[PDB]
Design a protein around this ligand. Structure first.
Ligand SMILES: Nc1nc2c(ncn2[C@@H]2O[C@H](COP(=O)(O)OP(=O)(O)O)[C@@H](O)[C@H]2O)c(=O)[nH]1
Ligand SMILES: [Mg+2]
Ligand SMILES: [Mg+2]
Lengths: 12, 391
């Protein structure tokens, strides 16, 4: 998921 | 050509009683190493005036300088006052792979010499090397013997290997003034940094640990937890333990994603998402960690060194007493706990630091060295470091 430069996030 | 930063990197710093010569020694080390191997020499003045840095909502005055020996690169920290070392060591604002303990040959160990060593052992400073300073003031080759004996005994008293500890007899000020014989002592010191302090282990080389922040499900694929890899690497296919708060659970990493790009592994420092096999969203929660199996356990009670923020650092205006039940912030979450002050102590004043024995309401994955913040309804009041896990 969900991030993209540097904030908490994701996927899998 | 180490603009590529290819040489081994070591973080060190000078500790010891005020006015024993920590800042002069630091200036001297940069100056002498610069002459000998090239580099940026630094004057007393620039290092002495330490700028303010923010550690854990805590203001600390710290000066940073770096220097090179033919084989290594050093990032070195020096602080004006005692409070700075206390806060620096507890919050771990400055990394210390090794410390240079400065002891004035004219004074011998003093109150802060002892506290720095004690705190050094409590926060995990691995190695210490001694520079017996102001030797230009002491020609009594015998009294120099006594100081060294005192320092060695002092170190062992706090579990450092006093008998094997390198001790250099020198004069920071005279080496800094160009006195060639004394400058050789500075080089002798740097040689011991080279030979005595082993190259530090890279976070990327430590067991995988990722503090869990968000958890969401992906229809079909599974449950993913997000967080920044604290250390190590998690590869797809590897097993992981979900530790803390609830009983420990086992799982397998079945996917890693960062910036929407699927990766085959997550590395220390990266903000990734981890897909876990056979774990529901209800079983996982913010505050637990993903860890390499067998490497970390949940604990509720521990011994710690804590620093209570002063009124000005935005901390309490009044002291606290036993009965105090604040929130202990470990990585990604708060956990209320019970405190036990040292024998005979009834209150802790803002700005004080003391050993505290804490008892959490529920377990948290922890080990010696884990930093934590103390807080009252969000508002930060202290910072601490776990010194010993009790249970
Ligand atoms: N005679 C002599 N004076 C020194 C030496 N090292 C430091 N100084 C003096 O002792 C005092 C304390 O210096 P400093 O480096 O600021 O101490 P720190 O508080 O440990 O950082 C200053 O007046 C220095 O000039 C030394 O090797 N010989
Ligand atoms: Mg100083
Ligand atoms: Mg003495």
């Amino acid at each position: 998921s969900c991030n993209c430069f540097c904030y908490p996030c994701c996927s899998c | 050509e180490k603009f590529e930063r290819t040489k081994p990197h070591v973080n060190v710093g000078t500790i010891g009683h005020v006015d024993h010569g920590k800042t002069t020694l630091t200036a001297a080390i940069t100056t002498v190493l610069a002459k000998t191997y090239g580099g940026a020499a630094r004057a007393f003045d620039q290092i002495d005036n330490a700028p303010e840095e923010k550690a854990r909502g805590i203001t600390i005055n710290t000066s940073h300088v770096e220097y090179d020996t033919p084989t290594r690169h050093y990032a070195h920290v020096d602080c004006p006052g005692h409070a700075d070392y206390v806060k620096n060591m507890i919050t771990g604002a400055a990394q210390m792979d090794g410390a240079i303990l400065v002891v004035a040959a004219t004074d011998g160990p003093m109150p802060q010499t002892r506290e720095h060593i004690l705190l050094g052992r409590q926060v995990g400073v691995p190695y210490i090397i001694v520079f017996l300073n102001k030797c230009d003031m002491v020609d009594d080759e015998e009294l120099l013997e006594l100081v060294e004996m005192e320092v060695r005994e002092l170190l062992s008293q706090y579990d450092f290997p006093g008998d094997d500890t390198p001790i250099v007899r020198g004069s920071a000020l005279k080496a800094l003034e160009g006195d060639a014989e004394w400058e050789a002592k500075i080089l002798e010191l740097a040689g011991f940094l080279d030979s005595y302090i082993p190259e530090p282990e890279r976070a990327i080389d430590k067991p995988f640990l990722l503090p869990i922040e968000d958890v969401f499900s992906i229809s079909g694929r599974g449950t993913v937890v997000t967080g920044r890899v604290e250390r190590g690497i998690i590869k797809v296919g590897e097993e992981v333990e979900i530790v803390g708060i609830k009983e420990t659970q086992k799982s397998t990493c079945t996917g890693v994603e960062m910036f929407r790009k699927l990766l085959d592994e997550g590395r220390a420092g990266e903000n990734v998402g981890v897909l876990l096999r056979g774990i529901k969203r209800e079983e996982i929660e913010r505050g637990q960690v993903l860890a390499k199996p067998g490497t970390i356990k949940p604990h509720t009670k521990f011994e710690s060194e804590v620093y209570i923020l002063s009124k000005d650092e935005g901390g309490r205006h009044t002291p606290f007493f036993k009965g105090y039940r604040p929130q202990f912030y470990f990585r990604t979450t708060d956990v209320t706990g019970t405190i036990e002050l040292p024998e005979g102590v009834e209150m802790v004043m803002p700005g004080d630091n003391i050993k505290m024995v804490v008892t959490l309401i529920h377990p948290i994955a922890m080990d010696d060295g884990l930093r934590f913040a103390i807080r009252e309804g969000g508002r930060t009041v202290g910072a601490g470091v776990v010194a010993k896990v009790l249970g």
